[PDB]
Amino acid sequence: MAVKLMGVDKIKSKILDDAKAEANKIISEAEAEKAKILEKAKEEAEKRKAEI
């Protein structure tokens, strides 16, 4: 019941770690799934004709 005031390291680390985490999870979850579907789709689609 006193972390708000006495806790600059928490609030300063919250938004910091939070914001950085959002951009850190979006860069990985993206390049990952992307490079996954890009190689998986391009392949399965290439080998397996008829996709529509």
2: domain CATH number?
Answer: 1.20.5.620
Query: Total structural domains in the chain?
Result: 1
Give residue 14's identity as a one-letter amino acid code.
K
Residue 32: helix, strand or coil by DSSP?
helix
Q: What is the dihedral of CA 7, 12, 17, 20, to 10 degrees?
A: 170
Distances (CA, A) of 44 to 17, 19, 34: 39, 37, 15
In 1-52, which residue ranges form alpha helices assigned H by DSSP? 8-47
Phi/psi at 26 (nearest 5 deg)? Answer: -85, -25
CB 36 within 8 A of CB 42: no
Distances (CA, A) of 3 to 10, 12, 50, 51: 8, 12, 60, 57
Question: Closest Cα to residue 24, out of 37, 32, 40, 34?
Answer: 32
User: Which residue range is the domain that position 30 belongs to?
Assistant: 1-52
Residue 24: helix, strand or coil by DSSP?
helix
**What is the experimental method?**
NMR
